[PDB]
């Protein structure tokens, strides 16, 4: 038993490791999207940079779980990071739709972890999720939903001018 461990259930420790893997999986998916939009035959560089930044944020989410695990006296256990579901991402609308789904998947995993933490009467873990993760997910989901509404307004996937304008005006200039 770790000398620091107190009120930390084995099931929560394991669930934190699984969540860490999912954060790294999400980071790798966003890295793939970055590389796709950087292709010479895609060439939407502000969209590419949006996904690059999302990839870095997910890696930070992962690292925060590693630090959490050690703070509670659990032990980090790593597994393979599975490659993303696609090798190419179609266009800005398809990528944003995949990102929305991924953010929802990550959100559901965090909500399920909160359920477990609640069941095991772990208020520290509940607070950590509420203060560091759940609102970040709500914000990200809203941002991507707003993007999808604008992409549809701009006539994606058919309207190339619309896609060009989204890259210039809706995502940060890089």
Nearest approach, Cβ of 31 to Cl ion (angstroms)? 14
Give the span between the Cα atoms of 143 and 140, in whole angstroms.
5
* Residue 55 CA from chain centroid, whole number: 7
Helical spans, DSSP H, in the chain:
10-38, 45-72, 92-119, 123-129, 135-153, 160-169
Contact 151, 143 (CB under 8 A): no
- Which of its own copies, Cl ion, Mg ion, none does 58 bind, CB closer than 5 to 8 A by kind? Mg ion
Residues that bind Cl ion (CB under 5 A): 1-2, 5, 7-10, 14, 17, 73, 77, 85-88, 98, 101-102, 105, 111, 135-136, 150, 170
Q: Which of residues 73-132 bind its own copies (CB under 8 A)?
A: 73, 75-84, 87, 100, 104, 107-108, 111, 114-115, 118, 121, 123-124, 126-131
Token pair of 68 as six digits: 């959490």
Nearest CB to its own copies, comparing residues 11 and 146: 146
Query: What SS3 state is found at 154?
Result: coil
| 159 counts as binding its own copies under rule CB under 8 A | yes
Residues near Mg ion (CB under 5 A) are 3, 10, 23, 58, 61, 130, 135
């Amino acid at each position: 038993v770790s000398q620091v461990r107190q009120n930390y259930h084995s099931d929560c420790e394991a669930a934190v490791n699984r969540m860490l893997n999912l954060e790294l999986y999400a980071s790798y998916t966003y890295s793939s999207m970055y590389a796709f939009f950087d292709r010479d035959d895609v060439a939407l560089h502000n969209v590419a940079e949006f996904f690059k930044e999302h990839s870095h944020a997910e890696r930070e989410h992962a690292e925060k779980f590693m630090k959490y695990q050690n703070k509670r006296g659990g032990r980090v256990v790593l597994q393979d990071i599975k490659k993303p579901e696609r090798d190419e991402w179609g266009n800005t609308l398809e990528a944003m739709q995949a990102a929305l789904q991924l953010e929802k998947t990550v959100n559901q995993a965090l909500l399920d972890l909160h359920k477990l933490a609640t069941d095991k009467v772990d208020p520290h873990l509940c607070d950590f999720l509420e203060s560091e993760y759940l609102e970040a997910q709500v914000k990200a989901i809203k941002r991507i939903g707003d993007f999808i509404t604008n992409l549809k307004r701009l006539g994606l996937p058919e309207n190339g001018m619309g896609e060009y304008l989204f890259d210039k005006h809706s995502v940060k200039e890089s």
